[PDB]
Each structure stands twice: as C-alpha cells, then as structure tokens.
RNA sequence: ACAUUUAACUAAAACCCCUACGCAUUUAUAUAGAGGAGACAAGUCGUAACAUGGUAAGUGUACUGGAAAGUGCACUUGGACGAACC
C-alpha cells in the first residue's frame, strides 16, 4: 500500500520538483533545499505523483495532509476500486475417488462466486494407465455441475511434457450470464 | 344359588346346581426401511498422533468443519524450559 502521510526529512532522490502549499509550480530543486524550505516555513512533504519522470512531492501542513488523506478514503467508499484476480490451483489424479472430487468441486464453485480464477491440472494416477481423452473427462464433469455459472478461461491443454492437462476456469461474465438465461428461457419457450 | 322328603310289627328308600376366555393379557418370532461394530484388505483425500511430530499432548464441555480434526474456557503432565554466578 501507499500512504499520504509526511515523507519526512531523508528524500529519496536528489533532485526534487516541488510544489507550493497552494499548488504553485516551485521547479526542480536539490533536496537539500527542500529541507531548508520546510523548516523555513513550517511545512510537511508529500509525494504527490511518482509516475513523472521528475519526482513530484508537495509541501503541505498537517491539517492538509488530513483533509486530503480523508477526501481519499471517501472516494474509495463511495466509487471502491476492484482488486486484482486472485489465481487459485487444484492438482488433481486421474483415479481420484469421486467422494474427494466431489468435496473438490464444492470447493472450485466456492471459488468461482468469489470471482477467482481456478487452474485446475489432472496428473495420470499412481500405477494407472489413463489416455489424454479420459482425463479430459474431468473437466467436464466437474463444470457440468456449474451449468451457468463457470466457463473455459483457458481449455485443456497438454503441459509438463504430456503427463497432464491443465485449464483455466473463471465466472461467467454478466453478458454471458444475460446470454445463458435468455437461451434457457427460449427453451423454456419452446417446451 | 340349592334347602330333609318318605318311612319306621326286623328296617330302609330317596338325594346328582349354574356361571369363564377376551377388539383381554404375557412373551417371542417374522417382515418395509434405517444404522452400528467387526473381519478381510490397504484404493481415494489429506497428514491428526508418535521427535518440542514441525501449533507440546490430553481431559471435560461448547460451537464449527470433506476427513482426520480446529477453536474457546477451566483442568492434567502421562511435555519441556538447557538446572552456581554469568
Ligand atoms: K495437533
Ligand atoms: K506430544
Ligand atoms: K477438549
Ligand atoms: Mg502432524
Ligand atoms: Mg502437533
Ligand atoms: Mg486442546
Ligand atoms: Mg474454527
């Protein structure tokens, strides 16, 4: 994460493009006499944008540097950005017992209303001999109990030299979701 | 409920009742279906226990969880703390 709060008086680069307490441009300046500037006139530093190729910090005081801070948390809790896809894996046999695929798949469509992406890979079991067909058929079962809600991200595909499979499943999007239910409903129409 | 009659110059005759047992009661067997334990054996998912077993173990109780189990509270040593000062 990163704060808004003071950088404090040790800044990371030396040359420092700086702004004033009420936003006029100060330039580029040595940090050395951005030290001098705070105790002059009293004042925090805070890094405002980091992107630029110039670093950009500001000198704020402190009650500044909270009203901004609370502006901040109220964007957030009025418009909450989306975190980022969290990726969760399964290794299964090609022998697993169906007592233990089925407490596996109540676990991936845990996952998928949480909106997570399961990599699921299917090895050939201990002393079995099983085809890439077989063990495709996984899949399937395990997707078929989510009718309308998971789909491929990625479709099977052979990996670790042709030893096992591996797909990607994720949740329907919500025009894939309208898309299932107005096929069903046709269906439904026809029967 | 039933109630002793005849007979008696030797003495004898006569006497014969009706109600219970059931859709009651006792125990057991058979049978739809639902579970438990054990034996054989060691597939499947984990790795709970045994070493400080990788979160010391366990007891009671409560809640929770695919599964061993997890967690709270009190209790036990059937754990340990390296045994002069440093
Ligand atoms: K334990
Ligand atoms: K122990
Ligand atoms: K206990
Ligand atoms: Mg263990
Ligand atoms: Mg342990
Ligand atoms: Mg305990
Ligand atoms: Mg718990």
Known sequence: KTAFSNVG??????????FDEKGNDLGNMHRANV???????????????????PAEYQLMTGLQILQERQRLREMEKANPKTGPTLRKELILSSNIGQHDLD????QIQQWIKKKHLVQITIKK?????????????????????????????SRPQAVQGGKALMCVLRALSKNEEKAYKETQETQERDT
Do not use: Y
């Open 9 to 18: 008086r040790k800044i990371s680069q030396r040359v420092i493009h700086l």
């Open 125 to 153: 079991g201990k002393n079995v001999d099983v085809s890439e067909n077989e063990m495709e058929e996984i899949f399937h079962q395990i997707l078929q109990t989510m009718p309308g809600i998971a789909t491929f991200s």
């Open 103 to 106: 407490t596996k798949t109540k």
């Open 35 to 53: 030290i001098r500037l705070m105790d002059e006139r009293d004042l925090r530093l805070v890094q405002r944008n980091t992107s630029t190729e």
